Amino acid sequence: GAYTGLPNKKPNVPTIRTAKVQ
């Protein structure tokens, strides 16, 4: 997948960069 930005919980990303990576 990708999984980016995990300081605590999907910050700006949708869902641990997996649902909508784009």
XYZ file of C-alpha atoms in Angstrom:
22
model
C 0.000 0.000 0.000
C 1.612 3.181 1.268
C 0.825 3.914 4.897
C 2.136 7.416 5.484
C 1.808 9.756 8.440
C 0.935 7.784 11.551
C 1.781 10.095 14.459
C -1.376 8.956 16.209
C -4.115 8.433 13.650
C -4.861 9.320 10.048
C -3.945 13.005 10.384
C -4.427 14.445 6.917
C -4.567 11.147 5.067
C -7.910 9.397 4.537
C -7.066 6.037 6.059
C -3.410 5.245 6.632
C -2.952 5.935 2.939
C -4.738 2.789 1.821
C -8.292 3.757 0.948
C -7.507 6.770 -1.204
C -3.774 6.897 -1.814
C -4.392 9.240 -4.720
